[PDB]
């Protein structure tokens, strides 16, 4: 929106807001990231620590699909259960809901948060954390491994 640009307010003020002394020249400090070590060193060090140098090993032709591993938390396990399954589980204490997190797209189950109170859960997954397995067992459910 040109009519809201501040240069319109600066029409008739000579320097266009860039100063009489300093002026607005082409590239007073170089182009792009020039001088990262010499005259922009203070900026780079104070705002971009770690920028220079290299660490770790290289990995030629790295594909992310073999590292794909979505995770879900036990505090979010219950949200996957449909409402009808949920109230059926609430009504019946002799059985526990059986959640296959893989069908919803999760490989590993992490043990953050808590589960519903006095509810057993049978969770099937590819991987699980020790804390998550302990919490499920304490709740009275079970863990199943699948691939």
């Amino acid at each position: 929106t040109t009519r809201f640009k501040k240069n319109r307010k600066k029409r008739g003020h000579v320097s266009a807001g860039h100063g009489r002394v300093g002026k607005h020249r082409k590239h007073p400090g170089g182009r792009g990231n020039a001088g990262g070590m010499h005259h922009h060193r203070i900026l780079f060090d104070k705002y971009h620590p770690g920028y220079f140098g290299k660490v770790g090993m290289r990995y030629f032709h790295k594909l992310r699909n073999k590292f794909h591993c979505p995770t879900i938390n036990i505090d979010n396990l219950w949200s996957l259960v449909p409402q009808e399954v949920k109230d059926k589980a609430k009504s019946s204490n002799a059985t526990a809901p059986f959640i296959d997190v893989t069908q919803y797209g999760y490989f590993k189950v992490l043990g953050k948060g808590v589960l519903p109170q006095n509810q057993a859960v049978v969770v099937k997954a590819k991987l699980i954390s020790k804390n998550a397995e302990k919490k499920i067992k304490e709740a009275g459910g079970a863990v199943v491994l699948t691939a």
């Binding site: 490989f107 590819k126 991987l127 491994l145 699948t146 691939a147």
Partner: protein
């Protein structure tokens, strides 16, 4: 070996009843006909051996198997092909001896 059904460890992966691949004509790419073998043997008889093949054979006759392998490697370019060529020269030498 069937998959264990686990996502880690040996023989990991989803459980399926593995099936042997059906035979296809491409299973014989490395093989040729008896006529081709006969023609190759006859042409070998007609044409003889190359100078480096003769050098390898002389080294094998002397008994310098390591030197023969080194010469074959320097000539052909790879250890695998050098081993194959040295073995073929050895077979030819055995046939000549018998």
């Amino acid at each position: 070996q069937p998959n264990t059904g686990l996502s880690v460890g040996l023989n990991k992966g989803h459980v399926v009843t593995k099936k042997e691949l059906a035979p296809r004509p491409s299973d014989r790419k490395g093989k040729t006909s008896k006529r081709v073998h006969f023609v190759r043997s006859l042409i070998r008889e007609v044409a003889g051996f190359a100078p480096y093949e003769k050098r390898i054979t002389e080294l094998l006759k002397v008994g310098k198997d390591k030197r023969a392998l080194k010469v074959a490697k320097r000539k052909l370019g790879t250890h695998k092909r050098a081993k194959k060529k040295r073995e073929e020269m050895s077979n030819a030498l055995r046939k000549m001896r018998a």
